[PDB]
Amino acid sequence: ETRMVIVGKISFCPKDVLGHGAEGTIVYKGMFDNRDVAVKRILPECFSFADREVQLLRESDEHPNVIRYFCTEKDRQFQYIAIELCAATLQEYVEQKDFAHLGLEPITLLHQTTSGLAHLHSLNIVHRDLKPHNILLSMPNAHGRIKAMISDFGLCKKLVPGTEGWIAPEMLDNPTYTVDIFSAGCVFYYVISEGYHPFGKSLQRQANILLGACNLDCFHSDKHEDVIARELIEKMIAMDPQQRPSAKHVLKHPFFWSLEKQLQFFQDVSDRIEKEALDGPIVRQLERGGRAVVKMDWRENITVPLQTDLRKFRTYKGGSVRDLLRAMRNKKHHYRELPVEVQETLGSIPDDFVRYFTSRFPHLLSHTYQAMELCRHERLFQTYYWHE
Amino acid sequence: RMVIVGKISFCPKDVLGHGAEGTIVYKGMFDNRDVAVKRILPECFSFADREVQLLRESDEHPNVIRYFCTEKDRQFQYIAIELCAATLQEYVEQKDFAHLGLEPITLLHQTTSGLAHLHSLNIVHRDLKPHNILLSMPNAHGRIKAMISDFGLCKKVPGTEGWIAPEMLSPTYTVDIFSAGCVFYYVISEGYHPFGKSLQRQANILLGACNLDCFHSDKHEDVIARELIEKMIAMDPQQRPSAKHVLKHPFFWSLEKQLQFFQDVSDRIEKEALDGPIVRQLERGGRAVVKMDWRENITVPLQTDLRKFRTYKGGSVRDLLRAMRNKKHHYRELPVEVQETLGSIPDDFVRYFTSRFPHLLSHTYQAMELCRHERLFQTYYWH
Ligand SMILES: Nc1ncnc2c1ncn2[C@@H]1O[C@H](COP(=O)(O)OP(=O)(O)O)[C@@H](O)[C@H]1O
Ligand SMILES: Nc1ncnc2c1ncn2[C@@H]1O[C@H](COP(=O)(O)OP(=O)(O)O)[C@@H](O)[C@H]1O
Ligand SMILES: *Cc1c(O)c(OC)cc2c(C)c(CCOCCOC)c(=O)oc12
Ligand SMILES: *Cc1c(O)c(OC)cc2c(C)c(CCOCCOC)c(=O)oc12
Ligand SMILES: [Mg+2]
Ligand SMILES: [Mg+2]
């Protein structure tokens, strides 16, 4: 009637449905040792479990962003999987007007997703089906902190994977991390714009994925974060799979950087450029985009107090990017000995100081990161770039 | 080396921090739940058992902390209260605190409504401050909350250097309200005191020196806060607003509530003459807030589209208000280009305007008091 289903260890009352999956799949709320879990029952005729991959996940350290499959058991006609019981899917996070994000903010969230995914790829495993619904939010712990974990991995298909809208194009063989990095890109933009898809509406989505149409209409060219984000997503959702950035690669990116990390970068650059010829390849590179970034003369687009105190020292070109970079490194390093007025059109440090400049020079950070490869090694830049 | 005095019991070692005048506060146990207990010298503070009983005979308030029980030993007094996680001090000051969680405005709303609970019963706090405002522990499912504390006791001058109302040096609800203002600015400024450093604080309070240096005038929200804060902390006791009076203020309004007002006005002003006091009043500050002509300070599609009708001035606040009430009420029929520069609604649509007209909301709220008593405006105003 409405009697409980065992197939122990797993157990669940069949009225406790959490939601339907694709091909006659269903997910209920159940029980395990005695802790709650969610049990998902897949028709062995529709989906194919990859037990070896998981046996591989267990015998390698746990990642806090890749969900745990507790056990699995078979009844005569069904496959039952017990997994960490979660509270919601990205979908609600983004789209539920009143969802209570709690602690975590979109960028950390994406940092978590991408980190977990990177771990999966570290074990030569490809998810093949990322999307808001396969990226889940934990319930709150004792300390109340909530996190995010990717799911429904290693759970393939028999008699094409993925979901209309999120399918890397080149899948229309044995896939490769490039696919998942496409799906990632989409979710990234989905989260940031607060619901919009880059491709960009249910019905046209896959068609437009095939054609290569993007939108990205939310990313303006005058905002620092919009620029740094677009620079990445545009590259993740790239039509050419061999252009899509590696997993860890996406993790070093400027996009995730603290304000402190940002400003710290800005400086660390400057300290190289002194004692480097301007005819030189490095500075010539840093000045290629030049004027556009600096708005012709950067002195004309900052505060009057700051141009006065700078004035008192000259040796700041103003159409020059490098001079804008040391100008920062100095106004910063001598910060304590500054006039007060000047201390307060910026300040304090690092957050307000950096934001001053990136607010005025949206293309600054992006441009500077892109310029300052060539120092992929240096022994020192390994914190901002990846050398391998 | 455990200490009983049941039903309260605590380890003397589990200390949570020293309070005033010799007070010490430990982590103990009550029924079998964890609690905080504080031991006071009966000789230095005076508990008020009548006040607490009264609060206890009354419906709980979620933002006013609970006293479970109290017990005297030969030489001390011990008090058992809900065990909280930290004070407003840490919330503001601790670079990595995990907030987690909850926004400053609802935080101050919470503190205020509790306060108003206290004043509902004719009971005044007298020593409000960050250290006397606590953050609950994460609950069953991870939501944090803020409650006031250390009330109902006294001293055998009340308050703390930095937070005492001016007239208490040389009481009524006005005193708390001042301390409240102080905290509001402390919290919004992320650390700064209005008066505004430990030593010059009380002095300056007597003198009247403020700062509010963090409130620009070009930001809708700063203008809103400042306009209220400055009034909480006002030198004159008769000027400081009622407790729940402060709960009705725009400072706490949702985007949607802000917008609903904007509109709820236009629908009032319309179909009345300009000789009428109301309109003439609304344009008192006029040109400056609309920026001479607001038509020149809005987005391009929107003027292009608002060209097609006007009949719209640009030196008229009422015409900018009407504008919002039309462009919103027809949002559906707008040209997509236009629908896209604002929207969705209410949030993005109301910020379109308040981003560019910082004094717009403030200005209108003031002018429109004239209709304080009307059925439609009680949700916005106080009596
Ligand atoms: N760990 C979980 N906790 C709660 N609900 C879940 C969990 N995992 C999956 N679900 C629910 O089941 C629905 C569909 O199941 P499934 O086939 O696993 O995913 P999808 O919808 O991604 O294809 C999901 O949208 C989700 O609401
Ligand atoms: N309910 C409580 N839970 C946990 N700690 C508390 C509680 N009440 C007070 N404290 C701690 O006690 C310390 C001071 O004791 P108290 O009597 O409040 O003096 P003060 O008024 O300076 O806070 C505070 O710093 C706070 O950490
Ligand atoms: C603004 C500024 C710049 O740009 C700079 O460039 C190297 C240096 C300094 C220094 C060293 C100080 C410290 C005070 O030195 C004063 C003596 O100068 C004649 C500063 O305040 O600002 C800069
Ligand atoms: C923008 C706008 C304004 O300002 C306005 O003020 C009177 C009215 C309208 C209306 C009525 C509509 C609906 C479309 O009407 C076109 C003419 O037919 C009545 C609108 O889209 O925008 C405004
Ligand atoms: Mg799923
Ligand atoms: Mg206290």
PDB file of C-alpha atoms in Angstrom, chain B residues 25 94 96 120 127 134 155 162-164 173 178 197 207 209-210 213 251 277-278 286 325 336 346:
ATOM      1  CA  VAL B  25      30.604  35.227  33.212  1.00  0.00           C
ATOM      2  CA  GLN B  94      36.325  40.163  13.186  1.00  0.00           C
ATOM      3  CA  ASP B  96      36.608  36.407   9.235  1.00  0.00           C
ATOM      4  CA  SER B 120       6.195  48.573  25.595  1.00  0.00           C
ATOM      5  CA  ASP B 127      23.269  50.307  29.248  1.00  0.00           C
ATOM      6  CA  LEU B 134      24.589  38.992  21.397  1.00  0.00           C
ATOM      7  CA  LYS B 155      24.647  49.484  39.672  1.00  0.00           C
ATOM      8  CA  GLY B 162      31.238  55.926  24.865  1.00  0.00           C
ATOM      9  CA  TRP B 163      27.532  55.152  24.950  1.00  0.00           C
ATOM     10  CA  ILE B 164      25.899  57.251  27.651  1.00  0.00           C
ATOM     11  CA  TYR B 173      13.331  55.511  26.614  1.00  0.00           C
ATOM     12  CA  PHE B 178      20.486  57.486  21.683  1.00  0.00           C
ATOM     13  CA  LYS B 197      37.073  57.402  19.641  1.00  0.00           C
ATOM     14  CA  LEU B 207      29.804  68.674  23.218  1.00  0.00           C
ATOM     15  CA  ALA B 209      30.536  66.441  17.995  1.00  0.00           C
ATOM     16  CA  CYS B 210      29.477  63.854  15.362  1.00  0.00           C
ATOM     17  CA  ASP B 213      31.984  60.757   7.743  1.00  0.00           C
ATOM     18  CA  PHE B 251      15.851  52.670   6.471  1.00  0.00           C
ATOM     19  CA  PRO B 277      -0.485  72.538  -0.711  1.00  0.00           C
ATOM     20  CA  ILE B 278       0.718  69.033  -1.426  1.00  0.00           C
ATOM     21  CA  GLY B 286      12.737  70.648  -6.382  1.00  0.00           C
ATOM     22  CA  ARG B 325       4.200  54.987 -11.981  1.00  0.00           C
ATOM     23  CA  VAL B 336      12.286  45.655 -25.091  1.00  0.00           C
ATOM     24  CA  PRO B 346      10.653  45.780  -8.032  1.00  0.00           C
TER      25      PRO B 346
END
